[PDB]
PDB file of C-alpha atoms and ligand atoms in Angstrom:
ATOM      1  CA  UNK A   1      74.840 -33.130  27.478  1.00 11.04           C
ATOM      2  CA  UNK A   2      76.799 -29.897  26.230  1.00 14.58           C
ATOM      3  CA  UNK A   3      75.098 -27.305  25.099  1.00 15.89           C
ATOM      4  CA  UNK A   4      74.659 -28.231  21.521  1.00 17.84           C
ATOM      5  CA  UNK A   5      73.779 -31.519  22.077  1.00 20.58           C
ATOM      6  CA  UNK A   6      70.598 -30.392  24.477  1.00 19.95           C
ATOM      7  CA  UNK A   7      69.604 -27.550  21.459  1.00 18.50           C
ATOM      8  CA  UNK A   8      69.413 -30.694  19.389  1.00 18.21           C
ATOM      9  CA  UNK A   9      66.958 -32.839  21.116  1.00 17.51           C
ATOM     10  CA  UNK A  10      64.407 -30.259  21.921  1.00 18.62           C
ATOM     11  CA  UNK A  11      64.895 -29.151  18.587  1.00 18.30           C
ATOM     12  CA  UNK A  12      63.950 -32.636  17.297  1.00 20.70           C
ATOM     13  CA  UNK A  13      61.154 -33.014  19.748  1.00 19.72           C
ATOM     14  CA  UNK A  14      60.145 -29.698  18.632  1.00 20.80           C
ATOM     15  CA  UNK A  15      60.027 -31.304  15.105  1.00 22.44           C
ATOM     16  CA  UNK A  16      58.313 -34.342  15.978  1.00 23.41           C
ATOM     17  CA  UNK A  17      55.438 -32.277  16.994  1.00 23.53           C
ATOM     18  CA  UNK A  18      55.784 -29.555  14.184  1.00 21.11           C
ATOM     19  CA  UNK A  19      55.384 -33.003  11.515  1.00 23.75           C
ATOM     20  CA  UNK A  20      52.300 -34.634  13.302  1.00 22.35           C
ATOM     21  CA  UNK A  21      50.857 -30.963  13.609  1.00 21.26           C
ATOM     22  CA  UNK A  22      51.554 -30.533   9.830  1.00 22.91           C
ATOM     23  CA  UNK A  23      49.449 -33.869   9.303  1.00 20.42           C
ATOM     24  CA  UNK A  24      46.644 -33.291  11.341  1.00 19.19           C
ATOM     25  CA  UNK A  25      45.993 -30.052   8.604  1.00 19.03           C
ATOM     26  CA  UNK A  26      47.003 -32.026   5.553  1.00 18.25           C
ATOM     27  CA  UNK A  27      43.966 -34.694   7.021  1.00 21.34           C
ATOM     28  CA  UNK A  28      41.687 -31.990   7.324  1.00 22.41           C
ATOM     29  CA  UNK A  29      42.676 -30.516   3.938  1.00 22.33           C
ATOM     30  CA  UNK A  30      42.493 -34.248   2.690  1.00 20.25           C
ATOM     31  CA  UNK A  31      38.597 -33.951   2.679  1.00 18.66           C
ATOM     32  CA  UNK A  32      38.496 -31.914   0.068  1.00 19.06           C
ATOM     33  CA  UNK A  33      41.342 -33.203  -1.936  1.00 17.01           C
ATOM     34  CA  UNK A  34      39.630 -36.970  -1.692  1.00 16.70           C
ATOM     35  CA  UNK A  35      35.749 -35.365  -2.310  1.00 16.72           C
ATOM     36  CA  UNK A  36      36.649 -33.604  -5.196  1.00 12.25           C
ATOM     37  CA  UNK A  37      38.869 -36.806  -6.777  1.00 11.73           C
ATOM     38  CA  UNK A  38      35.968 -38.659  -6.304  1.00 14.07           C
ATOM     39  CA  UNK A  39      33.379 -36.197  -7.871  1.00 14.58           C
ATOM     40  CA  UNK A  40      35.599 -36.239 -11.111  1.00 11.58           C
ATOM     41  CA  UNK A  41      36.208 -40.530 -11.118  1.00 14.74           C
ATOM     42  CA  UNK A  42      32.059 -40.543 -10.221  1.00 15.83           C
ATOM     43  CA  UNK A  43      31.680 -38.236 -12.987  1.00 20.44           C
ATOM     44  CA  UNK A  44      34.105 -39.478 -15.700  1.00 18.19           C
ATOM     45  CA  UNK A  45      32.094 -42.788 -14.724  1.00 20.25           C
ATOM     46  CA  UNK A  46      28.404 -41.323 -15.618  1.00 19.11           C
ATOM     47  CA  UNK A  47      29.818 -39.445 -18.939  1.00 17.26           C
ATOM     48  CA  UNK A  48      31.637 -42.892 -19.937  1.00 16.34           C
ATOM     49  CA  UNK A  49      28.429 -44.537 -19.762  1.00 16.79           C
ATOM     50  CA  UNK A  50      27.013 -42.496 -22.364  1.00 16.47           C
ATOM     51  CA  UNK A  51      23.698 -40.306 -22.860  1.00 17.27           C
ATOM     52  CA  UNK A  52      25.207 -38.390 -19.088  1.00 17.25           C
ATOM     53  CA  UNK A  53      22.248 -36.978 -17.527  1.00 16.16           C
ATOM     54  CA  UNK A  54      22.818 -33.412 -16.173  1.00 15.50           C
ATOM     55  CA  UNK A  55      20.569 -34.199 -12.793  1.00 15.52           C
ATOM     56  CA  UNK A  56      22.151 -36.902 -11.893  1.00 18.42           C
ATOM     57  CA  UNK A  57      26.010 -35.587 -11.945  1.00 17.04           C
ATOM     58  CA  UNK A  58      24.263 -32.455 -10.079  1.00 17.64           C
ATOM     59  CA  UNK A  59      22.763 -34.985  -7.639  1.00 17.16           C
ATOM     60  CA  UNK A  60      26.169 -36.909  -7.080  1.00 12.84           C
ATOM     61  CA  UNK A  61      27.766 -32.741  -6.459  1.00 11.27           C
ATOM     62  CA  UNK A  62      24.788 -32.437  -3.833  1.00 15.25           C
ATOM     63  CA  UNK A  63      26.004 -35.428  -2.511  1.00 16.06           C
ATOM     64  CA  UNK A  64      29.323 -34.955  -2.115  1.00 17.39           C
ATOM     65  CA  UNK A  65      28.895 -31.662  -0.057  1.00 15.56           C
ATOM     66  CA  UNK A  66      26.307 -33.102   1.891  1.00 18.50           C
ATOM     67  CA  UNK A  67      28.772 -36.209   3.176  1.00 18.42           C
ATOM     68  CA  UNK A  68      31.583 -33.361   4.596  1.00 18.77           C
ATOM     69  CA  UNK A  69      29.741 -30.804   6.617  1.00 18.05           C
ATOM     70  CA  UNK A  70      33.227 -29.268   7.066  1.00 19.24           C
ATOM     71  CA  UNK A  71      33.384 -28.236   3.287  1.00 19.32           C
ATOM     72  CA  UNK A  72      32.403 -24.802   2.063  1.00 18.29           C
ATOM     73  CA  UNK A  73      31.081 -25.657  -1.138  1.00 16.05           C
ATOM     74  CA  UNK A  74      31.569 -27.944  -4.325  1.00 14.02           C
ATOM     75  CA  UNK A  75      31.833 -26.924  -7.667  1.00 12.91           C
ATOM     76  CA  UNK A  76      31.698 -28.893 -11.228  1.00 12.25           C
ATOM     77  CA  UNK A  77      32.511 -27.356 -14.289  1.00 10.36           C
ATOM     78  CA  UNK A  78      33.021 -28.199 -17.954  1.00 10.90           C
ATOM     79  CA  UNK A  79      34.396 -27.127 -21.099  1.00 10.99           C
ATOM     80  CA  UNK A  80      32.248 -26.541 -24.416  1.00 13.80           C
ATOM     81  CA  UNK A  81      30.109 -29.444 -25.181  1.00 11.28           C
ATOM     82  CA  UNK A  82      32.319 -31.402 -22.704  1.00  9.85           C
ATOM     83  CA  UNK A  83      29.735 -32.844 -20.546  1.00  4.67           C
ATOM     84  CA  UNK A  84      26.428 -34.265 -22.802  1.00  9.35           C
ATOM     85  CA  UNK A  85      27.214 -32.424 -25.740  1.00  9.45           C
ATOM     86  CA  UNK A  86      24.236 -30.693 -25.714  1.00  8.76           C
ATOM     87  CA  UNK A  87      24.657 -27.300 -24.613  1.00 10.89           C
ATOM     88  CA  UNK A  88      22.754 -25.719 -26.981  1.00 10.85           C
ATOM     89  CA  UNK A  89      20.033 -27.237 -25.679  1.00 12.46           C
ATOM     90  CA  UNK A  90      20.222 -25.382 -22.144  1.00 11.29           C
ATOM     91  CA  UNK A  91      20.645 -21.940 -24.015  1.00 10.78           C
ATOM     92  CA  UNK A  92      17.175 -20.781 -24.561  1.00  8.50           C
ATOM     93  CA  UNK A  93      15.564 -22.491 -20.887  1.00  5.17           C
ATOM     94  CA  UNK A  94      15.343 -20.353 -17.616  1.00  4.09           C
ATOM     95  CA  UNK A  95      18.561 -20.314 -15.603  1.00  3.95           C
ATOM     96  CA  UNK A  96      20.978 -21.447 -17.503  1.00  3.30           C
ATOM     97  CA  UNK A  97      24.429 -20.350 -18.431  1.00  2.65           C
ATOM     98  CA  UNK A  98      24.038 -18.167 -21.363  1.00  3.66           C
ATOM     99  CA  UNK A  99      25.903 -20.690 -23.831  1.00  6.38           C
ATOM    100  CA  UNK A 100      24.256 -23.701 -22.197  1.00  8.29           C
ATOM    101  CA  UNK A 101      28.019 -24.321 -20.335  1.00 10.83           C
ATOM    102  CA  UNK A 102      27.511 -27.149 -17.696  1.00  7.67           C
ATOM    103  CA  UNK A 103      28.583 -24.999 -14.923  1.00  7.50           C
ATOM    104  CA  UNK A 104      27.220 -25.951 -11.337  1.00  3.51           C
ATOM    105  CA  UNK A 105      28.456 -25.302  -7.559  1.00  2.00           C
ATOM    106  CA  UNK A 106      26.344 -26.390  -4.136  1.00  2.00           C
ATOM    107  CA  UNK A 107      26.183 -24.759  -0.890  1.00  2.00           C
ATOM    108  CA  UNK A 108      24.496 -24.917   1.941  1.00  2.66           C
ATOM    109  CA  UNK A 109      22.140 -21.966   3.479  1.00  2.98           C
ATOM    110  CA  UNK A 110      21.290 -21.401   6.803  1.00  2.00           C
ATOM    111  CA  UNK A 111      18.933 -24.236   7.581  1.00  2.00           C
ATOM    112  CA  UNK A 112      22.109 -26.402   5.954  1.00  2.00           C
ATOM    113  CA  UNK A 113      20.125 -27.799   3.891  1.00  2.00           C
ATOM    114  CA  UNK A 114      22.133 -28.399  -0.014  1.00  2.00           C
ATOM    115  CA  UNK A 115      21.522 -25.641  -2.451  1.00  2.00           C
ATOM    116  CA  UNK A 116      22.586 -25.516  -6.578  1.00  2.00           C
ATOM    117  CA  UNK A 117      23.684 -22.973  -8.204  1.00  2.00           C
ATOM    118  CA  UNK A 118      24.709 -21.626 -11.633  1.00  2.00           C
ATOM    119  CA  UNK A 119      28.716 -20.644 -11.790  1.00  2.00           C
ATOM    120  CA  UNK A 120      28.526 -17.359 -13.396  1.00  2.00           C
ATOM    121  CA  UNK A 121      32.413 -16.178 -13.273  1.00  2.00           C
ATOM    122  CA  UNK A 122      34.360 -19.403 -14.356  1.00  2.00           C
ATOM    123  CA  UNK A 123      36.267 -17.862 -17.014  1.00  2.00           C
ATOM    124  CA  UNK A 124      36.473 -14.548 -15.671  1.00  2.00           C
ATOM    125  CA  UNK A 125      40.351 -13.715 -15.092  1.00  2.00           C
ATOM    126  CA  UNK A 126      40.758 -13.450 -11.257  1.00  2.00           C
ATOM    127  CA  UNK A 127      37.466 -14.299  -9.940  1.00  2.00           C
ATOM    128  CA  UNK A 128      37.583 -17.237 -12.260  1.00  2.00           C
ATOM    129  CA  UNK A 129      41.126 -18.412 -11.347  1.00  2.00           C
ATOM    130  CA  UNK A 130      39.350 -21.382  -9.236  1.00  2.00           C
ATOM    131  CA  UNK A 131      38.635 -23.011 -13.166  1.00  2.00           C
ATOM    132  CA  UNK A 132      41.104 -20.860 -15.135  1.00  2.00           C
ATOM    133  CA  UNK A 133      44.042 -22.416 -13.107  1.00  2.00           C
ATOM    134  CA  UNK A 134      43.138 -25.877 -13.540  1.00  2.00           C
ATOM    135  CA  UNK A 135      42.461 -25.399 -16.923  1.00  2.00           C
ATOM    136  CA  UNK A 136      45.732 -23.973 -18.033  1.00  2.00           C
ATOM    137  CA  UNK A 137      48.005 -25.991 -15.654  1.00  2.00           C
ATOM    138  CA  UNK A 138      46.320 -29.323 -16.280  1.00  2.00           C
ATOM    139  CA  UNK A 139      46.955 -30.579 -13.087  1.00  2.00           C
ATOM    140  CA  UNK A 140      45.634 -30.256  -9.128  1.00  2.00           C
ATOM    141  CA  UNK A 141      45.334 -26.753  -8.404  1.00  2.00           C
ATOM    142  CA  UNK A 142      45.626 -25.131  -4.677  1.00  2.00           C
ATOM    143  CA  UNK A 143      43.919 -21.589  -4.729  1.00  2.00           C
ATOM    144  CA  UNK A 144      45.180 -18.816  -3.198  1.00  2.00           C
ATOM    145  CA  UNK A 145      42.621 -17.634  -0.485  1.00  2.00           C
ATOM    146  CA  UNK A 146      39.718 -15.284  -2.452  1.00  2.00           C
ATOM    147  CA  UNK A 147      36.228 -14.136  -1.601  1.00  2.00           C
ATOM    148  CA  UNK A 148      32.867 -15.151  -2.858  1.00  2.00           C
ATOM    149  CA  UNK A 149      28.746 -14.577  -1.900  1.00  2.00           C
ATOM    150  CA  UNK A 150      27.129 -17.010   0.234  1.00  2.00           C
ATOM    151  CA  UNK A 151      23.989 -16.658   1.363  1.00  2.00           C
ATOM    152  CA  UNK A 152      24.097 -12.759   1.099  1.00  2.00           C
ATOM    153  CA  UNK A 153      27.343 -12.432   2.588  1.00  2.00           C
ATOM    154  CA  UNK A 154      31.606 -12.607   1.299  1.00  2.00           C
ATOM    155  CA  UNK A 155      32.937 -15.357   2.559  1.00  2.00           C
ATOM    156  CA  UNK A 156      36.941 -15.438   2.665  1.00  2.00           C
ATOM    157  CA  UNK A 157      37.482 -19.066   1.162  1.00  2.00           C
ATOM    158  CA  UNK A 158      40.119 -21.560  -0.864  1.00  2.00           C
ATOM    159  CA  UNK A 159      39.837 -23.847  -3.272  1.00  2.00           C
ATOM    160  CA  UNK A 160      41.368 -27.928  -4.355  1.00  2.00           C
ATOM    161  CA  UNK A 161      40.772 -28.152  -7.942  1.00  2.00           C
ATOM    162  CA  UNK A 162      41.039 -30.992  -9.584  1.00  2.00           C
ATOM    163  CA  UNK A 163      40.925 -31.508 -13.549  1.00  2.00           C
ATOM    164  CA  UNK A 164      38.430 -33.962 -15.079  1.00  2.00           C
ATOM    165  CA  UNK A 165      41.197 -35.292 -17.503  1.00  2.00           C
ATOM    166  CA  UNK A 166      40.348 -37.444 -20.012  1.00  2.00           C
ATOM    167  CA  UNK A 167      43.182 -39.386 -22.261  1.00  2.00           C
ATOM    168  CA  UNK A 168      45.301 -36.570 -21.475  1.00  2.00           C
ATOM    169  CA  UNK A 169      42.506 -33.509 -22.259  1.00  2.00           C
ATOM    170  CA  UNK A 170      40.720 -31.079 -20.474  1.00  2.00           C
ATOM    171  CA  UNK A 171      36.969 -31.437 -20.486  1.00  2.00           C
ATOM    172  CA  UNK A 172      36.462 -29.604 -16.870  1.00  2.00           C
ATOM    173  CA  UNK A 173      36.963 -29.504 -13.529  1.00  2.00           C
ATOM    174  CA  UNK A 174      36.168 -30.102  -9.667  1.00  2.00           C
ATOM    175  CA  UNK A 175      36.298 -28.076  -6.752  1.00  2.00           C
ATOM    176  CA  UNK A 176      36.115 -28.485  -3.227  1.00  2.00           C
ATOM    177  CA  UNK A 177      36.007 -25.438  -1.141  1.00  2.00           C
ATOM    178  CA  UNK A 178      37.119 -24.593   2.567  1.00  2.00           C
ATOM    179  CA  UNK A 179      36.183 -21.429   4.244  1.00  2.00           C
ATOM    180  CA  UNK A 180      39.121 -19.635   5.977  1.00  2.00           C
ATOM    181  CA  UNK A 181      37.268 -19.531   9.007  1.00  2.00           C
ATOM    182  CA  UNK A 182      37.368 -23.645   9.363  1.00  2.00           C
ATOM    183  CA  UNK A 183      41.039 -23.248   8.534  1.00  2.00           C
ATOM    184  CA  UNK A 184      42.086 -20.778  11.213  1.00  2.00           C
ATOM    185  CA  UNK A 185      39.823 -23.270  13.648  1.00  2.00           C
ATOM    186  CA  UNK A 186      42.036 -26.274  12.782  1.00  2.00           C
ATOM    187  CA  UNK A 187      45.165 -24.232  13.455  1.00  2.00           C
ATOM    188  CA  UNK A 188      44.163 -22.165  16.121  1.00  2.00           C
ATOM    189  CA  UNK A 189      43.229 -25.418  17.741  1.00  2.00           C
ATOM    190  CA  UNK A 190      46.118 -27.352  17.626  1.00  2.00           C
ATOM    191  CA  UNK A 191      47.359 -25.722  20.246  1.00  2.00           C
ATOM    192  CA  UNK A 192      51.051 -26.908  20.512  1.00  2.00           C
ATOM    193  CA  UNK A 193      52.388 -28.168  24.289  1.00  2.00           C
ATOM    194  CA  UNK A 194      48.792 -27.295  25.541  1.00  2.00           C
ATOM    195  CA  UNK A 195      48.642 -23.944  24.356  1.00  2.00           C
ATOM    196  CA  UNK A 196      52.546 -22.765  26.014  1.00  2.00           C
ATOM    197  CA  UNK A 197      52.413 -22.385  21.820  1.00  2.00           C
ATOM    198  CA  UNK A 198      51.261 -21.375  18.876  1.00  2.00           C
ATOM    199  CA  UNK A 199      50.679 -22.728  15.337  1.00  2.00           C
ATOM    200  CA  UNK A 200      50.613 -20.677  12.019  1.00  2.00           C
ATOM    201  CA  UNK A 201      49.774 -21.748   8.987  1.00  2.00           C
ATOM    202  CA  UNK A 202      50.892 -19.860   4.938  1.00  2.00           C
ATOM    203  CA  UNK A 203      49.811 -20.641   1.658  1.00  2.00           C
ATOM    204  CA  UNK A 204      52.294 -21.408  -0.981  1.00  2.00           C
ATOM    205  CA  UNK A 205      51.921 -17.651  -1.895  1.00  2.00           C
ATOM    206  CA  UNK A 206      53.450 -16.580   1.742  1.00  2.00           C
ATOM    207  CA  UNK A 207      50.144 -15.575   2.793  1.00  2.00           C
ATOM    208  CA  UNK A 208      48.930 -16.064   6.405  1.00  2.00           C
ATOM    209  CA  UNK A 209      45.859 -18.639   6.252  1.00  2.00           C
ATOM    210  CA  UNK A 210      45.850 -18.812  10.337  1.00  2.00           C
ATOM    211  CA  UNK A 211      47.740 -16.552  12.957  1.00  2.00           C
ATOM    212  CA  UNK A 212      46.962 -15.712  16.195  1.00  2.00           C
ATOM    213  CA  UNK A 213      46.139 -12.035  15.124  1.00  2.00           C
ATOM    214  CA  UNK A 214      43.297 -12.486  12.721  1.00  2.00           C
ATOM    215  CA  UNK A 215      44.124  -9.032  11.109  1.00  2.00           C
ATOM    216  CA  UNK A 216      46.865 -10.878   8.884  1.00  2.00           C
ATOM    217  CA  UNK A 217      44.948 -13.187   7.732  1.00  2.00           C
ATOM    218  CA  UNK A 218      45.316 -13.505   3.679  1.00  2.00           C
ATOM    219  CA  UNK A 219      48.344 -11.049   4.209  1.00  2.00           C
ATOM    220  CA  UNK A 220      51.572 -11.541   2.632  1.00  2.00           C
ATOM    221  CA  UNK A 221      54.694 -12.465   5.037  1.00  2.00           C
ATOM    222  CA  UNK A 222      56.987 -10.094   5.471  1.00  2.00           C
ATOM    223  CA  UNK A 223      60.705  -9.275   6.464  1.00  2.00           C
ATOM    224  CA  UNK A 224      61.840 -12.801   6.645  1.00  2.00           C
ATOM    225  CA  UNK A 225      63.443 -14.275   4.108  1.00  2.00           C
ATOM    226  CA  UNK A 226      64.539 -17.452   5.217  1.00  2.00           C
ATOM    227  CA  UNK A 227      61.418 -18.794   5.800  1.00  2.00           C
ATOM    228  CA  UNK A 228      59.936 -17.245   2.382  1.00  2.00           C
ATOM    229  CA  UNK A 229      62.437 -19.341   0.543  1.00  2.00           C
ATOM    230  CA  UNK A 230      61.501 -22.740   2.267  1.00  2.00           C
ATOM    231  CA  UNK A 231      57.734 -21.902   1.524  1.00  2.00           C
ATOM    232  CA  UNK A 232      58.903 -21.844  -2.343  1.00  2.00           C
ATOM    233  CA  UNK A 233      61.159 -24.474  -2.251  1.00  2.00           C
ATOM    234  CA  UNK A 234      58.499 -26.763   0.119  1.00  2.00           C
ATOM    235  CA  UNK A 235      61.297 -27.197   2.331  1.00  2.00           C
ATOM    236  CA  UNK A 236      61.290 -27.683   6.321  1.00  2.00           C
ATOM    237  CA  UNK A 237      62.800 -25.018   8.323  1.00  2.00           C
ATOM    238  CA  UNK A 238      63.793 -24.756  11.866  1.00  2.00           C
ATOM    239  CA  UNK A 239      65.523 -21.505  13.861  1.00  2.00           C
ATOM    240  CA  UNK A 240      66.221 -20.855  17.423  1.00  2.00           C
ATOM    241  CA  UNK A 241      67.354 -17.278  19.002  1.00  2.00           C
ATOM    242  CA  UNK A 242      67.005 -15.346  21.624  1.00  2.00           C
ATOM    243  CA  UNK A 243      64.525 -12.999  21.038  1.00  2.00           C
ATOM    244  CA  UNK A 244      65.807  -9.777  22.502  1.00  2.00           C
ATOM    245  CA  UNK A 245      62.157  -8.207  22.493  1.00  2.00           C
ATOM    246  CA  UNK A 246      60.645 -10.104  24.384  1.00  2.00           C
ATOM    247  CA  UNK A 247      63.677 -11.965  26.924  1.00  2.00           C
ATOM    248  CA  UNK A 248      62.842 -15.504  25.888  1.00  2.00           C
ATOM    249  CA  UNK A 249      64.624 -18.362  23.725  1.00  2.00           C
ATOM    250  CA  UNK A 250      62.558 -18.991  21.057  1.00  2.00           C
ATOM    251  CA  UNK A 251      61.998 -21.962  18.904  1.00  2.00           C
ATOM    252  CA  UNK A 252      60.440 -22.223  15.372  1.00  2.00           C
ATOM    253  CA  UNK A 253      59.707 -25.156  13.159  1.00  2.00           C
ATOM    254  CA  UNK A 254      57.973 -25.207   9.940  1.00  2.00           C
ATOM    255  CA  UNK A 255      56.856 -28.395   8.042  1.00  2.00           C
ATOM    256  CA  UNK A 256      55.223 -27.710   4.962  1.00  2.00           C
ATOM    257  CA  UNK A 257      51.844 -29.489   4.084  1.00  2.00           C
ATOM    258  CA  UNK A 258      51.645 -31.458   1.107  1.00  2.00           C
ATOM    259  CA  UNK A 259      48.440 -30.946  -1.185  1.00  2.00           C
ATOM    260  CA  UNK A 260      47.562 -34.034  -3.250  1.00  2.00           C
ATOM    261  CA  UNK A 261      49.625 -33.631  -6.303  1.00  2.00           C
ATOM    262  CA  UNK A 262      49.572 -29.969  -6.500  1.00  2.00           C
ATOM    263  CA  UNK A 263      53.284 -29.657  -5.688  1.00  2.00           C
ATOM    264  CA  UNK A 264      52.642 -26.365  -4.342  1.00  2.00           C
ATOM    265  CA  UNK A 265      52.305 -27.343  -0.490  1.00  2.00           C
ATOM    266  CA  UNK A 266      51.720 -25.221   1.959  1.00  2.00           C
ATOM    267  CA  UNK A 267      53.346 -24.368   5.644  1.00  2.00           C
ATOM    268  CA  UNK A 268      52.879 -25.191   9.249  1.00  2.00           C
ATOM    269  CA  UNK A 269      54.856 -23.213  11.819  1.00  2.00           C
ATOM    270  CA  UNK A 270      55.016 -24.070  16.013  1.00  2.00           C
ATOM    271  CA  UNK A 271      56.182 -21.416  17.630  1.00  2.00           C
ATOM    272  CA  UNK A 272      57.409 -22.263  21.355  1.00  2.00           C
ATOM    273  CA  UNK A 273      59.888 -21.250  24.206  1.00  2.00           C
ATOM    274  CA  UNK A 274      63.145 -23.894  23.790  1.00  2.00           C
ATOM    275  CA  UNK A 275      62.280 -23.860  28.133  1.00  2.00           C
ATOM    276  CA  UNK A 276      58.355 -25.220  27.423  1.00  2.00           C
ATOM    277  CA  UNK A 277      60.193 -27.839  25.172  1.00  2.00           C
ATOM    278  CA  UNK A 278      62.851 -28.801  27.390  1.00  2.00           C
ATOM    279  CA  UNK A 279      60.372 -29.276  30.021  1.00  2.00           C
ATOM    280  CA  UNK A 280      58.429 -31.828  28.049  1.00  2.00           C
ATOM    281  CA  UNK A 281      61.865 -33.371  27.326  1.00  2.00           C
ATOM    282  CA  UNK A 282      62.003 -33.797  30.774  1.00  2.00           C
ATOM    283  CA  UNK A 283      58.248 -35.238  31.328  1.00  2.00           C
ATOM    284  CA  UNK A 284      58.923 -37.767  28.860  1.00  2.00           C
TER     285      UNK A 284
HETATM  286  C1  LIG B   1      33.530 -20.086  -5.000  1.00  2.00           C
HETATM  287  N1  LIG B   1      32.904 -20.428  -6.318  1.00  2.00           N
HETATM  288  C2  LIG B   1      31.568 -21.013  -6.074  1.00  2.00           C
HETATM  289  C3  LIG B   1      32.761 -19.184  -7.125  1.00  2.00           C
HETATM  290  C4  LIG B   1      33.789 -21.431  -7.037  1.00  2.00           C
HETATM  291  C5  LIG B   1      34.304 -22.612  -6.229  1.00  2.00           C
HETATM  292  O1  LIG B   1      33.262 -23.485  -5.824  1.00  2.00           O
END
């Protein structure tokens, strides 16, 4: 093989593993994407059927964290009158949203045990982008890593959002909610050719959502165009050099990870020596 010829097959083999790497986050990620698609079917269901009852669309939320122990949170939201249509019912009773808003999310505290909440900053620019995205885009929403309380303390999380439409309108929406701190453990446990390297993982954004140095996480990247432009454009994106820094041929691929219909997916990066690769060419 000449020399070109041997950069190509451990940089397809370096692919290969880049792709299924990709897909082992976009299952994880899946979780959320399929528990919050079926809050909003479960709940279209129950509003369809007339008379909705507020408890029982809270139970099926309390539900739906309780079946994915890996999931941060839930949240269900909805417009003006959207839900029951009887918000101004809920106005004058203890704990409610201030306008009677059907605005829930569930947690968990530290026995695990299910907890429900009021929403409080759902249409609060920033904070609120987690329901002000949805809202205005109309469509499945991937949040940019933010922080929230739980249980007394911030938590560093993200959010799938996905809109209750109805005949093309906007009566609310569903989240389901990953701390960062499960992400970086899916990454930083893929562990690529048995830990010879290392996986990374950016948002849409360019931000780091996993890295080996947990001081960049939420960070933007920086100083490397290339593979800013095939986060944007969702694009793979493979590079091989000698890295002068540190004496070894390095490899890089990046896969992005697609996110329901968000069409904002994110990125997976392996970073490897080209010799660990063509050493598992060679064990093949
Ligand atoms: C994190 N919030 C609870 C504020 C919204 C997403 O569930």
């Amino acid at each position: 093989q000449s020399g070109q010829q041997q950069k190509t097959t451990a940089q397809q083999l370096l692919e290969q593993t880049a792709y299924t790497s990709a897909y082992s986050v976009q299952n994880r990620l899946d979780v959320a994407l399929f528990a919050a698609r079926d809050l909003v079917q479960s709940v279209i269901s129950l509003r369809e059927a007339g008379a909705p009852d507020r408890a029982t669309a809270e139970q099926l939320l309390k539900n739906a964290l309780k079946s994915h122990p890996d999931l941060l949170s839930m949240s269900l939201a909805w417009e003006p009158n959207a839900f029951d249509g009887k918000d101004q019912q809920y106005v004058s009773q203890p704990e409610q949203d201030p306008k009677g808003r059907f605005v829930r999310y569930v947690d968990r505290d530290n026995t695990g045990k299910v907890a429900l909440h009021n929403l409080t900053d759902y249409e609060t620019p920033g904070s609120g982008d987690y329901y002000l995205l949805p809202r205005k885009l109309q469509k499945e929403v991937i949040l940019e890593p933010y922080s929230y309380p739980y249980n007394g303390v911030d938590v560093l999380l993200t959010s799938i959002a996905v809109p209750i439409m109805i005949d093309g309108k906007f009566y609310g929406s569903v989240t389901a909610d990953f701390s960062l701190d499960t992400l970086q453990q899916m990454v930083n446990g893929i562990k690529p050719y048995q830990g010879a390297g290392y996986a990374t993982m950016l948002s849409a954004s360019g931000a780091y959502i996993a890295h080996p140095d947990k001081t960049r996480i939420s960070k933007k990247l920086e100083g490397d165009p290339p593979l800013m432009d095939s986060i944007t454009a969702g694009k793979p994106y493979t590079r091989q050099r000698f890295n002068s820094f540190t004496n070894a041929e390095m490899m890089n691929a990046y896969v992005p990870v697609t996110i329901g219909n968000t069409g904002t997916p994110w990125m997976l990066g392996v970073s490897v020596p080209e010799q660990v690769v063509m050493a598992e060419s060679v064990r093949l």
